[PDB]
Ligand binder design. Structure first.
Ligand SMILES: [Mn+2]
Ligand SMILES: [Mn+2]
Length: 181
């Protein structure tokens, strides 16, 4: 069976805006997508999920993810000044204007409860909401509050399942799943 290249797959699978934002993220962090290509795919996947999460309720969420880091912090600080929300210690992915809280979106190939616990230990915040997705349909969220309804989250889960299936068809899934740290 042919083993495809992950860079080929990423450039064929994600829309060009997502690919370009992922390229800029990796440049900002001094990473080379041509070598760390599983990470390139992971960054693209996380961007796509953040955008889908926002699109599930247009106008409800401010998007923080995808922006360069300086601009992202400028947006976080603006939200905090406007809404009175407490400033997060690490850059979150969205701000929810309805529930008045920042959100960390996780997408993982590891077990979602462990990943959830790791993220909650990292950000160390009593306000920021965490929502973890896997590629096989499992999810986990702060206080069992999943924010979006079943139809919206099913759309996200189906996209993730499709990505995993297309990776597997190209012989890419085994390495992509194994390489997460
Ligand atoms: Mn991020
Ligand atoms: Mn993640």
């Amino acid at each position: 069976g042919p083993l495809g290249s992950m860079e080929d797959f990423v450039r064929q699978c994600f829309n060009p805006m997502i690919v370009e934002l992922a390229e800029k993220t990796m440049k900002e962090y001094g990473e080379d997508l041509k070598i760390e290509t599983n990470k390139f795919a992971a960054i693209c996947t996380h961007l796509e999920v953040c955008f889908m999460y926002s699109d599930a309720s247009k106008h409800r969420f401010e998007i923080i993810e995808g922006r360069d880091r300086t601009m992202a912090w400028t947006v976080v600080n603006s939200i905090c000044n406007t809404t009175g929300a407490e400033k997060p210690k690490f850059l979150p992915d969205l701000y929810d204007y309805k529930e008045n809280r920042f959100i960390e979106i996780g997408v993982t190939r590891r077990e979602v409860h462990i990943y959830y616990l790791e993220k909650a230990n990292k950000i160390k915040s009593e306000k920021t909401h965490i929502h973890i997705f896997s590629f096989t349909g499992e999810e986990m969220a702060t206080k069992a509050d999943y924010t979006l309804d079943e139809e919206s989250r099913a759309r996200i889960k189906t996209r993730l399942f499709t990505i995993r299936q297309e990776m597997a068809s190209r012989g890419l899934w085994d390495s992509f799943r194994q390489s997460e740290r």
